């Protein structure tokens, strides 16, 4: 009843061009079985959405990577939020929600916007730049470590650690094993910065610690919760901004619409998140036997959700392969859905909005002018190098 496929969704060949294989995964059936890794897969929008919104059956506390925490040891102590189910999930989630709240966005918006404007003006003086290293990476590194309240020393470990986190959700292939091997210096840096004295008062990390006074988290929970914000947030946002720049270069009509109404910047970034889905995949583990789209899945089984495929499923989206900055993007699963839906989504949207606003107001054209290179990661989709020439408005 369940079709078995040999597609490896963690192979370099798949990362290089995943979209034909994603259609094969969708059209095979609502539920497939991937023989390469012995997991179930759901690639259509309806089942991916249903699984995300059924946390008592499709749980997160046994890991959201391939590894089942009931069978194997986690490579680092489990996240208190990502790798937890309700009710244990609830109070750490509430703390991060308040630390990254709408009210908090007011305190950082002016500096985040000012840094984006300044970066675009700096890049316009150079003309020919790498939109990853010099923009998609440089901009988040210029605002987010400061807003966390990190010291200057050691920040060279931040991008390597985020790459490791997302490679470690994958299967035990070369990308994962290379990342975890000799990763101790990255872990040691990150764990040290999670201690209260190393976090600047007023920043995100210090505010997490301040919530230990309230009873929502204990002081011994706060370092692991800070760790969540040094794990998530950097690489996915880098990849989303780089994909937006790529899209505005490949779809010049959409850059022109954005230039004509810069208030479309926020939705232009949301559409980039749907289009690219920087987080391609996550797993759940079944807590009981369950029927899903006619498929009977046993207990204790890993279920792979193709978020990127769900965001391109023609059963749900018109012209899913087009970048459309006025698309009604509500309902996309690029940030997840349900109790775990990205608690950092307002920070992500702020960074993406203000960068795309700066481009909309200052740049007349974005032309690819060098070899484009893909960045390979077991969980993240994104570019390594994007040489462009920026023409000033
Ligand atoms: C475009 C950028 C981003 C994308 C595509 C993204 C994607 C996601 C997705 C798909 C989830 C759901 C995980 C699941 O269901 O298991 C998630 C959760 C989460 N994200 Fe993001 N994220 C982004 C930016 C950020 C930022 C900027 C931060 C921090 C400031 C962040 C921190 C988190 C955390 C802590 C969670 C766990 C929430 C929970 O389990 O309740 N992410 N993210
Ligand atoms: C969605 O990606 C992540 C990765 C790590 C964490 C965490 O370490 O809590 C949360 C979300
Ligand atoms: Cl760590
Ligand atoms: Mg400082």
| Burial of 102 (C-beta count, 10 Å sphere; 0-12/13-18/19+) | exposed
Q: 154 forms bridges with which residues in the sheet?
A: none
**Ligand 2 pocket, mutate which of 75, 163, 165, 282 (most atoms under 8 A from CB):** 165
- Joined together, the tokens standing for residue 336 give 């997840």
Residue 157 annotated as lining a ligand binding site? no
Residue 247's alpha-carbon distances to 164, 258, 271, 311, 367, in angstroms, are 27, 12, 10, 16, 11
What is the maximal distance between C-alpha atoms in the chain? 60
What distance in angstroms lies between residue 347's CA and the mean position of ligand 3's atoms?
22
What distance in angstroms lies between residue 197's CA and the mean position of ligand 3's atoms?
18
d(CA 320, CA 340): 25
Question: For the chain, what's the residue count?
Answer: 393
- Reported resolution in A? 1.5
DSSP character for 376? P
| 3-class secondary structure, 128 | strand
Method: X-ray
Q: How many structural domains are present in the chain?
A: 1
Please check whether residue 216 is in contact with residue 94, taking contact to mean a CB–CB distance below 8 angstroms. Answer: yes
Strand 302-306 and strand 363-368: the pairing is unpaired
| 3-class secondary structure, 88 | coil
Half-sphere exposure of 391 (CA within 13 A, CB side): 13
d(CA 109, CA 111): 6
For residue 57, which of 226, 287, 334, 219 has the smallest C-alpha distance? 287
For residue 57, which of 364, 290, 280 has the smallest C-alpha distance? 290
Alpha-helical regions (H) of 251-306 = 252-260, 265-276
Contacts with 185 (C-beta within 8 Å, 6 or more apart), sequence order: 157
- Joined together, the tokens standing for residue 6 give 């040999």
Residue with tokens 């289009």: 275
What distance in angstroms lies between residue 152's CA and the mean position of ligand 4's atoms?
6
Alpha-helical regions (H) of the chain = 12-16, 19-28, 45-52, 90-99, 102-126, 138-148, 158-168, 174-180, 184-193, 204-210, 222-231, 234-250, 252-260, 265-276, 307-310, 345-362
What distance in angstroms lies between residue 326's CA and the mean position of ligand 4's atoms?
40
For residue 10, which of 376, 385, 383, 382 has the smallest C-alpha distance? 376
Nearest listed ligand to the Cα of residue 154: 4
Residue 254's alpha-carbon distances to 63, 128, 179, 314, 368, in angstroms, are 39, 21, 37, 21, 16
Please check whether residue 96 is in contact with residue 79, taking contact to mean a CB–CB distance below 8 angstroms. Answer: no
What distance in angstroms lies between residue 228's CA and the mean position of ligand 2's atoms?
6
d(CA 393, CA 391): 7
**Ligand 2 pocket, mutate which of 77, 82, 235, 340 (most atoms under 8 A from CB):** 82
Pocket (CB within 6 angstroms of ligand 2): 79, 81-82, 165, 228, 231-232, 279
Residue 236: CB atoms within 10 Å: 26
For ligand 1, whether the C-beta of 246 sits within 6 Å is no
| 3-class secondary structure, 365 | strand
Strand order in the sheet with 58-59: 4-5, 32-34, 39-42, 302-306, 281-286, 58-59
Q: Which secondary structure element, helix H or strand E, spans residue 369, and what is its range?
A: none
Please check whether residue 376 is in contact with residue 360, taking contact to mean a CB–CB distance below 8 angstroms. Answer: no
Number of H-type helices and E-type strands within the chain: 16, 13
Which atom of ligand 1 approaches the CA of 239 most closely? Answer: 1
Residue 355: CB atoms within 10 Å: 29
Residue 157: CB atoms within 10 Å: 19
d(CA 151, CA 147): 11
d(CA 150, CA 380): 24
Which atom of ligand 2 approaches the CA of 83 most closely? Answer: 9
Residue-range definition of the domain harbouring residue 104? 1-393
Buried b (16+ CB within 10 A) or exposed e, 107-129: ebeeebbebbbebbeebbeeeeb
**Ligand 1 pocket, mutate which of 221, 232, 307 (most atoms under 8 A from CB):** 232
DSSP character for 233? S
């Amino acid at each position: 009843t369940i079709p078995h496929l040999a597609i490896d969704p963690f192979s370099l060949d798949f990362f290089d061009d995943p979209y034909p294989d994603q259609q094969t995964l969708r059209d095979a059936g609502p539920v497939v079985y991937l023989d390469k890794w012995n997991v179930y897969g759901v690639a259509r929008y309806a089942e991916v959405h249903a699984v995300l919104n059924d946390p008592t059956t499709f749980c997160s506390s046994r890991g959201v990577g391939l590894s089942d925490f009931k069978k194997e040891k986690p490579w680092r102590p489990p996240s208190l939020i990502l790798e937890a189910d309700p009710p244990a999930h609830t109070r750490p989630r509430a703390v991060l929600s308040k630390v990254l709240s709408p009210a908090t966005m007011k305190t950082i918006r002016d500096g985040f916007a000012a840094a984006a404007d300044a970066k675009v003006d700096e890049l316009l003086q150079r003309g020919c730049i790498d939109a990853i290293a010099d923009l998609a990476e440089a901009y988040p590194l210029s605002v987010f470590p400061d807003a966390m309240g990190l010291k200057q020393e050691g920040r060279e470990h931040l991008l390597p650690y985020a790459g490791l986190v997302f490679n470690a959700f994958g299967p035990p292939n070369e990308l994962r094993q290379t990342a975890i091997e000799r990763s101790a210096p990255h872990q040691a840096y990150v764990n040290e910065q999670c201690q209260r004295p190393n976090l600047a008062p007023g920043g995100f990390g210090a505010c997490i610690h301040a919530f230990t006074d309230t009873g929502e988290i204990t002081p011994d929970e706060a370092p692991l919760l800070v760790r969540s914000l040094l794990s998530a947030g950097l690489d996915e946002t880098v990849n989303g901004i780089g994909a937006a720049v790529y899209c505005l270069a490949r779809f010049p009509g959409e850059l022109q619409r954005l230039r004509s109404d810069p208030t479309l910047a926020r939705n232009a970034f949301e559409e980039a998140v749907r289009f690219e889905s920087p987080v391609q995949t996550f797993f759940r583990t079944t807590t009981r036997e369950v029927e899903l789209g006619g498929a009977v899945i046993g207990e204790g089984e890993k279920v792979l959700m193709f978020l990127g495929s769900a965001n391109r499923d023609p059963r749900r989206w018109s012209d899913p392969d087009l970048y459309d900055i006025t698309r009604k993007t509500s309902g996309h699963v690029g940030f997840g859905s349900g109790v775990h839906m990205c608690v950092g989504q307002l920070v992500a949207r702020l960074e993406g909005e203000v960068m795309l606003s700066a481009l909309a107001r200052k740049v007349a054209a974005i032309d690819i002018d060098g070899p484009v290179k893909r960045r390979f990661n077991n969980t993240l989709r994104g570019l390594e190098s994007l040489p462009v020439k920026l023409t000033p408005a």
